[PDB]
Amino acid sequence: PGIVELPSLEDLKVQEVKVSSSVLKAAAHHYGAQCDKPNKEFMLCRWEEKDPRRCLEEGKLVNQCALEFFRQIKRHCAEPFTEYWTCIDYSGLQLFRRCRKEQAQFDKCVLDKLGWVRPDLGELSKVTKVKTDRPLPENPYHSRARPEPNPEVEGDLKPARHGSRLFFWTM
Amino acid sequence: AKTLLHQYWDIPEGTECHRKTYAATSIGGASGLVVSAYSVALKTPTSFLEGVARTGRYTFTAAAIGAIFGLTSCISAQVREKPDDPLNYLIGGCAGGLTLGARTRSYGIGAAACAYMGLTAALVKMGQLEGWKVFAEPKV
Amino acid sequence: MMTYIVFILSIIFVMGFVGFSSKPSPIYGGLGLIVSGGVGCGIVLNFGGSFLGLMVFLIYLGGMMVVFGYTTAMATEQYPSNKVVLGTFITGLLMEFLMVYYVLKDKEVEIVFKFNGMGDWVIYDTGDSGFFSEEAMGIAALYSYGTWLVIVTGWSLLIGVVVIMEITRGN
Amino acid sequence: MNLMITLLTNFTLATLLVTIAFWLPQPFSMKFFLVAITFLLFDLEIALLLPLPWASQTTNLNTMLTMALLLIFLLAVSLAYEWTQKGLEW
Amino acid sequence: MTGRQARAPLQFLPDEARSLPPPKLTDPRLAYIGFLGYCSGLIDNAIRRRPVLSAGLHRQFLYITSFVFVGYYLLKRQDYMYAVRDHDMFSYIKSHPEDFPEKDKKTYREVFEEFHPVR
Amino acid sequence: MSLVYMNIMMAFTVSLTGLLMYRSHLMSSLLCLEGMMLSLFILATLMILNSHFTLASMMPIILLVFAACEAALGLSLLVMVSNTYGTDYVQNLNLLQC
Amino acid sequence: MNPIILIIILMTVMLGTIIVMISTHWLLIWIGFEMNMLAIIPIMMKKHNPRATEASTKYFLTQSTASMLLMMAIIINLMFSGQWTVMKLFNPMASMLMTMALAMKLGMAPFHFWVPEVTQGIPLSSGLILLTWQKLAPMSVLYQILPSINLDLILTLSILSITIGGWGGLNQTQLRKIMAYSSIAHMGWMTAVLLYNPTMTLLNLIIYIIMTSTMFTLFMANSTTTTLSLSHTWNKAPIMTILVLITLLSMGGLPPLSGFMPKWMIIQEMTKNDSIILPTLMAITALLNLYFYMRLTYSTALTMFPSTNNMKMKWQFPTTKRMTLLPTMTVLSTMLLPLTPILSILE
Amino acid sequence: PFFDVQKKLGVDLDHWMTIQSAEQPHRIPARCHAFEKEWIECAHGIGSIRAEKECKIEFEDFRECLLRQKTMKRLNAIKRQRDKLIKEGKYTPPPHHSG
């Protein structure tokens, strides 16, 4: 019946953050601190419309925000950020209690030289308001109307009309 | 099955003949295979040649009754030229009962089978003629 | 060694069901049901299958066929193959060969269905954020929501105990 | 299929050990049955118990404690019933 | 016919059942139930060899009491069920005038039916 | 249609015919009942996994434990029949004629 | 047997049947049927004769394969549109397998081969409890899932069960086989009107359960297996004879008596549809299954067979059996004729 | 008969094992959540007969979400057509990884 409406290859070209996984995992909390403020726009778009191919401008926005954040952490202290994530890389699945002293070192670098207090637990939680520019959608479950209501039977009941109205045993 | 009984009743009766007798032989072969399947399940023939013989006898007799019913159906419908009566299939059921008694080689069974099969065949055509539904409305 | 490994293990599975539905001596039957349970474990672990298919393995291949072989050993003798057993095995292999041949070289095989005939890499997850292996947290219910179900299950097993001792000479 | 590779290598090397070991040199009681069924029923109750360490992280903890104690309590009632009622005696 | 507001659970006598007229005292149906209870006590004397009409009078009074009580509750439920059936019938009459047309009364000055004499 | 479901339904018919036609020993009949049980287990489990039917995923293990204790009762009945007789054939049961 | 253990087993039969009545999940219905089987197995083999052992074996095999075919039908239901709500099904094939499963569960014509064999070698109490609860437990399920059944299934099983319980039934003097063939005929009746108005089915279920309780209570009052033992009961006591007369005639269904009321209402709300030849066929077979009732009455209370002394000895002992509740059930079962508008007490 | 003590006592002890979209112990959906929500809202205040004859479109949408029959039929037709045209030899295929 109906055909989909796919986006073009012109919107499918954002400078992708082709970084690896352990550095992205170790660089998560301060990325939650400085950036990740305008991507709850994207989260609210994704949970008010269950439809990617629509919220992709905000996906490009979080892509450029994360690339800008890694640019800003690339230009300044630390270069031993590289030492910190390669200290945490080869430890299986990356427990954050593994390389703790260098975590303190990177925190002291970024604090005494740039700012960016680390989010204490549990501040990557605690349900957060977000305002947007687009108005909130209605009925994204694209369906028809609720077809028929049952007429609700009410009214005070009469007694029996001439008994059982079976063969006999009248009244 | 519904497909071959529908093929039997779809023929105008009427004369579109010998397809009627072929469909009636198919009905007879099916019913003989049914009853012979129950019998070979519930007897243990020992030997198996006896089991094949009993199934062949049951299928052969039921197909013979169906064939003779269809033959005198077609002949009575062509001769009387009145396709609405059940009397022609009364003749049909009595002929089928007589040849049932012929293939079991006793005559009182043939007489009672003439009577009962004639009454049931007249009732079947009569209920098809008025219109009495199979097993249900099932509405109210 | 290729894509249709779920289908091939299903072939060995139905072969095992034929292999003890041909009615051998019941210790060969227990062998056939053990082989069938192992390859059924293989099938469900191919769907993954992380807990339930290793869970059946302790019960049927850990607790049920043990007692079936036990009762084969202690009750029946069968002290000495046959025409009927191996003939039914031949006809079962013929029926499976015919069905899978018509699955292979045609579109679909219909008993009264439309089985869309190709191997099942479809359907599957599109790489979601599972993070807890959804079987695991599903069965990690039954103690918060599962009030009635585990109560009637344990009660049925208790009544099974008193039933077994009564028939085997209660008290 | 990686553990299937391990299973295949172990199975093939075991068959090599056996076949190279072989080509080279050339009534009953009811008391037998009660213990097996007692195993079977208590093993099924073990199967009901064993997802308990999966479950211990939820927002309904008192209820989990109550029904877990109910499962082991029912298992203990079954045990003590066949214990007192000459189920395992000689 | 089916419930019809089983939503709204089983409810042996609803709170809308206190609008119908109740079954009166000495109604003949519960009088029949009391006669059946008397006969039940009498056959209860008759099963064992205890003598009829005597030495069981408390059992006679008991069976009469119990059966008249149970029949009274079932008579109230029965009257409610017939009342709700009649009200639902008339509600579906009034709900759709389109499918139950009024038969205009063809009086017998113009209605034609043949004769077919029996001689 | 997730093609494997056809094979597991055909496997169910295999186990059901093995349950119905059975020549000599009752133990083979009971073990094919167990095979039918395994077939229902596997079929429903693949359905619930591919559905992501994650709330009521209890069906495989609970169907399993119930029909397993059914098989336990069947083992006890077969032991009782083999105890009061010599063997456990389908024959030597022709007493109590219908 | 301990009395505590018997109270426990009765508690579990009641628990399983109430779980079948009350639940809305399919697994719980299957659990209820299985637990009903597991509890009802040691009510049979109450003695230790091999007759009850073989009867329980046959019953267990048929009951377990019915249970597993029911589970097959449910897993087909979730292979199609899948939710665990007891409602309209979503496959004619699944409904076919499910109604054939329940037809194995409760006494039907292709499936009735275990019923006289399970009733013959057991005592009376086990037969009573199995007939009552094993003909009560599937009727709730069929009452639930009626709106998605091909009618030819139910109607074929009903017609053939009525005529098999008729024709098979002229040959046995084993009273348990007589009552079992009567159970087959009445279950055909009680299944027949499932798709038209199930109020008739449940009222017929009530009447049949009360009638069979009266009949088996009369047999438990004096232990009999044959009709000649009933003639000795004629010699020893006269009131049991008129009870056998009234209860056999109410199994026969005559219009002065209360056993006619389930037939007549079936014929009414069957013939308000276009079904007339099917009622007259069913009621001719209802005339058929009265004949073994009638020859039983002729053997018991109307003609008289020659008696044996030591009935002279049994005269000196008055009756000392306890009845559970015989007279209340009797006059509830037989004088219920002017209470036909207690039809609408049910829905 | 079916009774309603389930509704009468006010203990909804058995309504949670019943459908999808009742609250899982971690708040995750199934694969066909929204199709269920619109289908249940289509056939809620309904006497189960105009459910048969009115909510048919959304029910077929839900069924083809659940099994994905004809979508696999379309994909299989694409596969067989791709096989016969690569058997022919026209456009040695650039639908894999490159032009």
XYZ file of N, CA and C in Angstrom, chain H residues 3-75:
219
model
N -15.896 -17.884 36.269
C -16.259 -17.025 37.387
C -15.333 -15.811 37.438
N -15.624 -14.900 38.365
C -14.989 -13.582 38.366
C -14.535 -13.184 39.762
N -14.014 -14.139 40.533
C -13.409 -13.805 41.822
C -12.120 -13.024 41.597
N -11.473 -13.269 40.449
C -10.354 -12.476 39.943
C -10.647 -10.980 39.947
N -11.851 -10.592 39.545
C -12.251 -9.196 39.626
C -12.891 -8.842 40.956
N -13.492 -9.820 41.634
C -14.301 -9.539 42.813
C -13.447 -9.207 44.025
N -12.382 -9.975 44.265
C -11.570 -9.712 45.445
C -10.698 -8.478 45.299
N -10.496 -7.991 44.081
C -9.610 -6.865 43.890
C -8.142 -7.217 43.903
N -7.804 -8.494 43.801
C -6.426 -8.935 43.654
C -6.260 -9.378 42.211
N -5.576 -8.558 41.414
C -5.349 -8.858 40.000
C -4.069 -9.679 39.873
N -4.153 -10.895 40.391
C -3.002 -11.766 40.558
C -2.594 -12.479 39.278
N -3.393 -12.401 38.217
C -3.152 -13.207 37.030
C -3.222 -12.405 35.738
N -3.379 -11.087 35.817
C -3.525 -10.257 34.630
C -2.200 -9.733 34.096
N -1.088 -10.078 34.736
C 0.213 -9.565 34.349
C 1.015 -10.533 33.495
N 0.764 -11.833 33.599
C 1.330 -12.838 32.701
C 0.640 -12.888 31.347
N -0.228 -11.933 31.044
C -1.309 -12.126 30.093
C -0.988 -11.626 28.690
N -0.613 -10.360 28.546
C -0.400 -9.801 27.218
C 1.046 -9.330 27.204
N 1.477 -8.717 26.107
C 2.609 -7.810 26.168
C 2.120 -6.458 26.682
N 3.044 -5.506 26.812
C 2.824 -4.094 27.132
C 2.288 -3.850 28.546
N 1.988 -4.892 29.315
C 2.002 -4.771 30.760
C 3.446 -4.596 31.204
N 3.632 -3.920 32.332
C 4.943 -3.387 32.685
C 5.915 -4.499 33.051
N 6.920 -4.675 32.198
C 8.023 -5.586 32.420
C 8.853 -5.124 33.620
N 9.598 -6.035 34.273
C 10.340 -5.638 35.488
C 11.430 -4.607 35.251
N 12.007 -4.568 34.060
C 12.723 -3.400 33.578
C 11.943 -2.867 32.393
N 11.756 -1.550 32.345
C 10.746 -0.955 31.472
C 11.231 -1.006 30.025
N 11.093 -2.188 29.426
C 11.475 -2.418 28.035
C 10.228 -2.813 27.257
N 10.167 -2.568 25.955
C 9.019 -3.010 25.168
C 9.286 -4.375 24.544
N 8.256 -4.889 23.887
C 8.404 -6.043 23.019
C 8.718 -5.548 21.613
N 8.622 -6.439 20.629
C 8.938 -6.043 19.267
C 7.754 -5.364 18.577
N 6.526 -5.648 19.006
C 5.316 -5.114 18.375
C 4.434 -4.416 19.408
N 5.030 -3.495 20.169
C 4.335 -2.828 21.269
C 3.205 -1.920 20.790
N 3.517 -0.979 19.898
C 2.552 0.049 19.515
C 1.399 -0.524 18.710
N 1.676 -1.563 17.918
C 0.621 -2.272 17.205
C -0.375 -2.877 18.176
N 0.122 -3.441 19.279
C -0.769 -3.941 20.318
C -1.563 -2.835 20.974
N -0.923 -1.698 21.268
C -1.652 -0.647 21.975
C -2.780 -0.094 21.114
N -2.529 0.095 19.821
C -3.602 0.574 18.957
C -4.644 -0.499 18.686
N -4.262 -1.774 18.690
C -5.255 -2.817 18.463
C -6.164 -3.002 19.671
N -5.589 -2.955 20.873
C -6.378 -3.053 22.092
C -7.278 -1.834 22.243
N -6.777 -0.645 21.896
C -7.650 0.522 21.923
C -8.686 0.504 20.804
N -8.437 -0.234 19.721
C -9.468 -0.406 18.703
C -10.579 -1.311 19.205
N -10.227 -2.385 19.907
C -11.235 -3.378 20.253
C -11.481 -3.476 21.753
N -11.615 -2.344 22.439
C -11.801 -2.384 23.887
C -13.266 -2.377 24.308
N -13.997 -1.316 23.975
C -15.394 -1.220 24.359
C -16.299 -1.831 23.311
N -16.023 -3.086 22.973
C -16.504 -3.727 21.759
C -17.015 -5.114 22.121
N -18.148 -5.508 21.541
C -18.732 -6.802 21.841
C -18.184 -8.004 21.093
N -16.929 -7.933 20.637
C -16.162 -9.025 20.017
C -16.792 -9.574 18.739
N -17.682 -8.823 18.096
C -18.219 -9.189 16.796
C -17.988 -8.092 15.765
N -18.240 -6.844 16.138
C -17.676 -5.741 15.393
C -16.180 -5.586 15.638
N -15.606 -6.311 16.605
C -14.160 -6.503 16.625
C -13.716 -7.378 15.469
N -14.525 -8.376 15.123
C -14.193 -9.226 13.990
C -14.363 -8.476 12.680
N -15.398 -7.645 12.575
C -15.712 -7.016 11.298
C -15.334 -5.541 11.213
N -14.646 -4.984 12.203
C -14.311 -3.565 12.095
C -12.836 -3.256 12.313
N -12.169 -3.953 13.234
C -10.750 -3.728 13.489
C -9.865 -4.650 12.665
N -10.297 -5.011 11.453
C -9.595 -6.022 10.675
C -8.266 -5.500 10.145
N -8.223 -4.228 9.742
C -7.029 -3.654 9.123
C -5.878 -3.593 10.121
N -6.147 -3.068 11.316
C -5.103 -2.972 12.330
C -4.741 -4.339 12.894
N -5.678 -5.285 12.879
C -5.355 -6.642 13.294
C -4.434 -7.324 12.292
N -4.662 -7.103 10.996
C -3.762 -7.662 9.991
C -2.395 -7.001 10.049
N -2.360 -5.702 10.361
C -1.093 -5.013 10.573
C -0.338 -5.604 11.761
N -1.054 -5.908 12.846
C -0.419 -6.523 14.005
C 0.060 -7.942 13.716
N -0.730 -8.717 12.970
C -0.337 -10.083 12.635
C 0.897 -10.103 11.745
N 0.956 -9.198 10.772
C 2.128 -9.111 9.919
C 3.304 -8.418 10.598
N 3.088 -7.729 11.723
C 4.223 -7.379 12.571
C 4.740 -8.607 13.295
N 3.826 -9.455 13.771
C 4.214 -10.540 14.657
C 4.935 -11.652 13.910
N 4.441 -12.030 12.730
C 5.073 -13.119 11.996
C 5.929 -12.668 10.829
N 5.589 -11.534 10.216
C 6.239 -10.993 9.022
C 6.247 -12.026 7.899
N 5.047 -12.405 7.482
C 4.920 -13.425 6.453
C 5.165 -12.846 5.065
N 4.320 -11.907 4.646
C 4.365 -11.424 3.276
C 5.532 -10.480 3.025
N 6.080 -9.876 4.079
C 7.307 -9.106 3.920
C 8.470 -10.025 3.568
N 8.535 -11.187 4.219
C 9.500 -12.204 3.830
C 9.201 -12.765 2.451
N 7.925 -12.797 2.053
C 7.589 -13.231 0.699
C 8.141 -12.266 -0.343
N 8.026 -10.967 -0.072
C 8.571 -9.947 -0.962
C 10.093 -10.020 -1.024
N 10.736 -10.216 0.130
C 12.192 -10.321 0.171
C 12.677 -11.586 -0.533
